[PDB]
Swiss-Prot record, chains A, B:
The lineage of its organism: Bacteria, Pseudomonadati, Pseudomonadota, Gammaproteobacteria, Enterobacterales. Homohexamer. May interact with LetA in the inner membrane. May also interact with partners in the outer membrane. This is Lipophilic envelope-spanning tunnel protein B. Forms a tunnel that spans the entire periplasmic space. Is probably involved in the transport of lipids between the inner membrane and the outer membrane through the tunnel. Forms a dynamic tunnel sufficiently long to mediate lipid transport directly between the two membranes without the need for a shuttle protein. Binds phospholipids. Lipids bind inside the tunnel. Required for outer membrane homeostasis. Contributes to membrane integrity. The chain holds residues 515 to 877 of 877 of the full protein. Belongs to the PqiB family. One of its GO terms (cellular component) is plasma membrane. Residues 1-111 are annotated as: MCE/MlaD 5. Changing G193N: Partially affects function.
Length: 363, 363
């Protein structure tokens, strides 16, 4: 016996199994020494490698012939029978696993490789409905996998679901800094068209980063659409009497070109006006001014003629998601740029002069 | 022979098979001693572990090489040939299995691990149609698996299907308290759009908890939509001459923002008015008052013009699910909050002054 182990549950571990290292075989498991409360596992490694063995090492266990799918994959490694018959143990060093050996007496055998990387990077979410969440669900940023949900805990004292997820140690300091918005993505089949196609197969969690204190306690927000594409933009609040056909994902239009989208919809402080939160992209941030009137351009408007009736149908997005359109009135002194927070007043009718304005906006 | 067993049916059990413990091998099955009415099974365990053996232990049997799917999973454990050739027996302790040994002479071998946890947590449902139910169908609360249907019994004396399901022992006391609404979920493809996407693959049973006496005898209600999202809200009853386009899932609107949904539709006590049951969310509970007139806002309304005709089409939800909209008339003494049960009278026309009311509702 060269290095011992401890664990609470031993589903896979079988005596006589082979010790792996980077999916390569060195060492041997010899003894499962049982206890009533917490079982003990003993390992043999060679006398040269135990000098190479570091106190910053973690041991993770896996067992059985695993065919992994992982999209379009089936391959099984060059494997001995000792994994095929008995539950194996692999190991590797990492940087900051010294704290797991400072606490307790001996090392712990993690149930898989995922729980072996769950030191320091483990965060906790709070969701009202775990109908979209799943164990093994990846947390993605810009479509790059930076984390994974590993468990789901239901609480009936406070009726909500605590999902504890992990982050990889490169991104544990960059993310989880407070003001971080975790949001699931999901397919939508409704009056609003769908943009997410892969989420029918495998849903993930989009994330917005933030800056501040390392909180590591988060709330899962609703399924948001604006956050993924239109980011780090100029946030504009517009007040309206009605909602109308507006919604999350409704485009903001300038001469028919989509310059931004609506982030969210909320009642006002006093319940007389709804506020519609939108973001304009950085390339189009300079377009809005302090004198930039909005108007609701939602759905089809056509004029009847008595002698003869001229009609036109664009089949545009504002039928499905009724957009807000704007233009700047002409002024030879130009009003300054819009601030990070500014309240606009929506006009109910489209002002007729908007074709003939022609306000020069440079850069 | 160290511990014996009894069972009625013996599909899997084969003599010479290995005894498991937490999917780890200790002990050995030696003898299948037959009888005409109820067969006897005998087990060998080591003399150290039989002192460790507790009277609160259950034995469950499983047999054959089982590849489990469980979503995106295929893995087979580190297994001996003794499971691969012969039907094995695993065991574990639990808290309150002493009552199974108080009754009868010896322990019973359950047919699987699911029936071994079916002590005390076993409830009974009564459904009119078992077309949605299935054996192994999970009972979920907030998307967390808290139970499982294990059998289906058809009765032709009273033409209905008794489905006996289990609950895990953490949730047997919290749930099954009477006033508990069990409801299946199912995909819908109709005039009303679908919200449930996973239920095409695997349907489950949503559940509302209750408080009272431990009944453990329940009735399976219809497929409800309002219960999952809008919960613990202010229940409001509105009386109308017609149903119209209303239904379960029809949103309640305040200035175009969805504040609540319709729970169910029922004829009145005297068959002259239908009552429409709705719930308003806790964040929007303070919006309704004792003077809050409703009106039916269902589908598209547009005005014809003779010289020129102004038309607008929102493509809103009230075409698909015709919503009820409200606003509060102005009064310098404010009427109090709506009670837990209060009957409103629906107005057939939209009152024109509703834009210019502007009633101040604080908090």
């Amino acid at each position: 016996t060269t290095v011992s182990l401890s664990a609470e549950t031993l589903p896979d571990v079988q005596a006589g199994s082979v010790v792996l290292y980077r999916k390569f075989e060195v060492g041997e498991v010899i003894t499962v020494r049982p206890r009533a409360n917490a079982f003990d596992i003993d390992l043999h490694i060679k006398p040269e490698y135990r000098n190479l063995l570091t106190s910053n090492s973690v041991f993770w266990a896996e067992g059985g012939a695993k065919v992994q799918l992982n999209g379009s994959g089936l391959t099984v490694q060059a494997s001995p029978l000792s994994r095929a018959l008995k539950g194996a143990i692999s190991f590797d060093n990492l940087s900051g696993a010294s704290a797991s050996q400072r606490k307790g007496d001996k090392r712990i055998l993690y149930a898989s490789e995922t729980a072996a990387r769950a030191v320091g990077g483990q965060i906790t979410l709070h969701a009202f409905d775990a109908g979209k969440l799943a164990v093994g669900m990846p947390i993605r940023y810009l479509g790059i996998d930076i984390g994974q949900i590993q468990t789901l805990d239901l609480i009936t004292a406070r009726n909500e679901v605590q999902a504890k997820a992990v982050l990889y140690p490169e991104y544990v300091q960059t993310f989880a800094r407070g003001g971080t918005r975790f949001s699931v993505v999901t397919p939508q089949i409704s009056a609003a068209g769908v943009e997410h196609l892969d989420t029918i197969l495998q849903p993930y969690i989009n994330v917005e980063p933030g800056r501040g204190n390392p909180r590591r306690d988060f709330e899962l927000q609703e399924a948001t659409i604006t956050d993924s594409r239109y980011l780090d933009g100029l946030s504009i609040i517009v007040e309206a009497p009605e909602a109308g056909s507006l919604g999350i994902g409704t485009p903001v239009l300038f001469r028919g070109l989509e310059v931004g989208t609506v982030t969210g919809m909320t009642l006002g402080t006093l319940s007389d006006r709804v506020m519609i939160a939108m973001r304009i992209s950085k390339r189009y941030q300079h377009l809005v001014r302090n004198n930039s009137v909005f108007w609701l351009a939602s759905g089809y408007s056509l004029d009847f003629g008595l002698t003869g009736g001229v009609v036109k149908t664009g089949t545009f997005n504002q039928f499905i998601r009724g957009g807000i359109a704007f233009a700047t009135p002409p002024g030879t002194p130009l009003a300054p740029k819009a601030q990070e927070g500014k309240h606009f007043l929506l006009q109910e009718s489209e002002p007729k002069e908007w074709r003939e304005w022609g306000t020069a906006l440079p850069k």
